[PDB]
Symmetry: D2
Subunit: 339 residues, 4 copies
């Protein structure tokens, strides 16, 4: 009786997605930074499995596959299915930007072949800068008869061709995508600007769909149209920009009020970020994730402490209004994109 993705969304439930998986495996020594290739699926099944289980414990209702050769993709799907069966989670399929229509759809169908062999609960089109290739992806994938979702790494200023977010969203829903939204390249506020534009565009064309936000965990108020790749700090300097469990716990509420129901996360997101999403959205979802056992609510777990200040740090007010410090006073608070 595992409800499908569209059944959950249409019922009005929040479908929390897993965080940045290929970024969490790079800091854990299994992915390399620059090829970002998922060999660890076959080389280190225990690492990939444990990250999946940590995300499931956090509150993710989706186990996106970590996708030698198609053997790696297969093994990734078996690990994802194994972990998904342990909880209220759905295995998802992911198709990403190809590095002509005939060849792009060739690549996309060869990829989709594996996800059909493995019977993934639903599919995702993601990492798409251009929306032309994104609609090609939604077309090639909805032939499966499985729910398809389309995400782009495009800011409020539209795709690389220049197509505005609203036009991109309506073009994706037209192609068949039952869920649409933004992933990667921008922090949880610019992303929710793009998703609001997408909602408005879909309401303009009366093209009902489900909304989906998977932003960066980093703060990038100094990013140009080219996301956070062009920041001088990418990839090995973004530790300061990482969000806290309060920033993400604010983006969860923002995205919920904006009308997003597939509230997840991308590069920089960790299990505790996803737990922040789940704990924020708990009073609507009617439950708390498993990992909430190893956590209070708004730092409520520190109100048995030996010091008065650390004891008083345990409340929503303190952590919501606190202005955390960079700890790097010889560094600027913003940087010019290199590109």
């Amino acid at each position: 009786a595992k409800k499908g993705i569209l059944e959950r969304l249409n019922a009005g439930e929040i479908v929390i997605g897993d965080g940045g998986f290929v970024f969490a495996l790079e800091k854990r020594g299994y992915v390399k930074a620059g090829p970002w290739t998922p060999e660890a699926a076959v080389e280190h099944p225990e690492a990939v499995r444990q990250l999946h289980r940590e995300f499931l414990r956090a509150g993710s209702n989706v186990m996106q596959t970590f996708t030698s050769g198609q053997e790696v993709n297969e093994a990734a799907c078996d690990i994802a299915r194994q972990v998904a069966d342990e909880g209220d989670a759905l295995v998802a399929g992911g198709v990403s930007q190809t590095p002509s229509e005939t060849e792009v759809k060739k690549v996309f169908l060869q990829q989709l072949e594996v996800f059909m062999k493995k019977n993934v609960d639903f599919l995702i089109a993601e990492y798409f800068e251009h929306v032309e290739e994104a609609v090609w992806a939604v077309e090639t994938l909805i032939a499966s008869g499985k729910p398809v979702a389309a995400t782009m790494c495009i800011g409020p200023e539209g795709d690389l061709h220049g197509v505005p977010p609203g036009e991109c969203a309506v073009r994706l829903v037209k192609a068949g995508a039952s869920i649409i939204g933004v992933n990667c390249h921008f922090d949880p506020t610019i992303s929710l600007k793009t998703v609001k534009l997408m909602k408005e565009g879909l309401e303009a064309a009366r093209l009902k769909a489900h909304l989906m936000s998977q932003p960066l965990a980093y703060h990038t108020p100094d990013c140009n149209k080219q996301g956070f790749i062009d920041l001088p700090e990418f990839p090995f300097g973004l530790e300061p920009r990482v969000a806290t469990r309060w920033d993400i716990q604010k983006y969860a509420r923002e995205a919920y009020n904006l009308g997003v129901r597939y509230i997840g996360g991308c590069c920089g997101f960790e299990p505790y970020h996803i737990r922040a999403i789940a704990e924020e959205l708990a009073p609507e979802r009617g439950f708390l994730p498993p990992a909430s056992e190893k956590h209070g609510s708004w730092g409520s777990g520190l109100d048995m402490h030996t010091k008065p200040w650390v004891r008083a740090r345990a409340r929503k007010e303190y952590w919501e209004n606190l202005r955390i410090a960079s700890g790097r006073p010889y560094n600027p608070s913003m940087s010019k994109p290199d590109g």
Copy 2:
């Protein structure tokens, strides 16, 4: 033929220690922040085991155990021994400050703890988290009875212990108690920690009391910390993400500690497998080898030479990342904060 801790140190080798274990299991949902209890050792052996293995892959030569009650400590020791046997690493024992503070009862707690680590036959012991040096000396005394190498660390800054005992006096008093390795752990970022360790080195040289030096600093940057370390910063525990070091800051602390004469170069709260991998990759040309996890990393961002853009391809060199002045990304935030305490 697994060399012991003192054999490695006396041979001149660097003994890289594991990073903040309790802190890395809190962000992974297995430890709670505030009780900081290792209830995950029996509840989630796979999580603790995988963190141990990630640290081992990073380059750690020490699996400090993740230490009802004695059952949890035992299970932690079996997991640590399991992972240690998979590589060139040693299980370490850890005894820490008691919540109380008389000699007979503190040494009672210390001996009961030491019983389990004797049962499990840990390769060496650590006295750590000691604000006072009186209790740290008690620790070295109670633990060296094992006949195993004992190490002593305190979370004390350049201004001495809570009683005001200067770091050099602390180092001398610990080495006198029998501790073959002494150092500093926690409560301060790498530079303040390595200032304290410089003071300890000088103090030991003053009394001609030879010992091995050890540094397990915070991964956070805390230039605004008072004598009470990072715990009194308003951001602790759930606001320290900005302060987290990069693989370049830790890769600088590794060289600083090596030049300072520290050979047990590890890490504490905030340290992650990639930080320990930074330590190992920095100290590689001396150790004569690179850690396993270097297979999934270039040297100074070299792996980004593949990229399709010139401003992400030229990022692949020592100069760029060693001289880059990274940005906080929070321009509506101060770069420093006043300790609440």
Copy 3:
């Protein structure tokens, strides 16, 4: 043979204007912050005269008057004329917003009476949030037969009514204003965005005019549409935001390349800022201001020093590429507008 404002501009010359005059008399104890009244013109003629002479020495070619009641304005104009005659400067007239068309034009005409009595070389309409009142300004003032200039404190998002900057510019030039531009409420980059929009709008309608930039000396990258006044630091907290002689020496070149020829400054501008404008624009103007005798070019005057670092600070490269430090690490580098 003192060339008029329009003769200077039409000849292609740069007409450097004076800096923030009532803000520089508040830090000198003669103006009060909050009423911002020019009572000091009759109470302290020597202070107002010396500030005028400092600006004239800096390089200003415009001695805007520091304008009971009409007596104070007359005294201000006498001092301005006295100091203008000492150099290559023109006395300018200033009409500003009134705290119906008939009553507003009444106020404007009563003001203009004094400036006609004193025969000011040209007039300025300035500090106009709305462009409905600014066209009334240009209308009421061009009846003098004197050159009239119109400025608003409006950002790139238009006036308070919502009129875009380009429409404001064309509507001011239609009213008769021979010079148009922006003054106050934004730093020297947002201001030069608005002036770029004004140039573009004038070129859209073929409505030739002269451009004029009088920006804030403060840095306000965190300002909303209500200028710098709504920042929490206004008025007594803006010392950190103050520009250096390099920031202003860069805005001078920006405004020159943008096509602005009346390059001056508003609140926060000091004699050394105007001297920075003049020294930057010197190679075109063909000369240097008097105050350059007490200054080097890009810190060249520090070549005398005994220390090697302070000696090497004497370069264009060093001072143009240096990221100066706030010196307040317990302070945020940006702030949310209170309004």
Copy 4:
């Protein structure tokens, strides 16, 4: 009946000193940055006189002279005496580091000759890195029979030889100096650390003297023992570091509680900073300075605005507990000294 410096101090009164005079005339175009020479005293007597009068209006009770050769010094003393006679102020002499004891005392005596001709109400030894030359100064100057004061630009880590500040202070009191303190090179907080050490050292030796503080107006938390001159921002990049009228109103209270009664200011201090000192210390001195007429108390003058927030900014609570913003988010909040 103009009370002398020692009569005021011994009576328990606060003797507010003028601010950075050479530095204020550099921003006004009359002094050059790098030679820092006073030739404006004869070239521009009106500028020097107006700066003197602005400082006197602020609340300064001392009119330190602005000291072609000794003619410049005589003109400076004449202007200082002229302005001093207009209020409750005292002309003060000043001797600074030379660029052997016999030759140093020769130069110091040649200086003191002019101040004896002009009859300056008291003398100051200042800008002394070394305490050897500083005690030589106090020796050569106390022969005048006039009160002598000694200040050094030395931080909490002692003079350049290494003499601790307590030893410096006692060595200066022994030489005869009736007032001792610190001037320049450090912000108001480090300076007051040094003055605390001097007070403690004098109390160690039972060597009673009057305490004096003339700190920088800049914030320099990132300065090493060589003061602010070694910062990369010196001289033309210190605008961000400038203190506000609230920071100086805090330093005034600090110095008063520390036991300092000659509370003034060095480089970076302006008439409004000295007015901040005077307004802060008013409820003890029993009066407010003249310039307080053009100022409220803790921003009270903004009660007249039309906006609720700009009206509510008028509060001690608001301006005392406000973290002002640098407005430069692409710049670090601290910088490494270049020396």
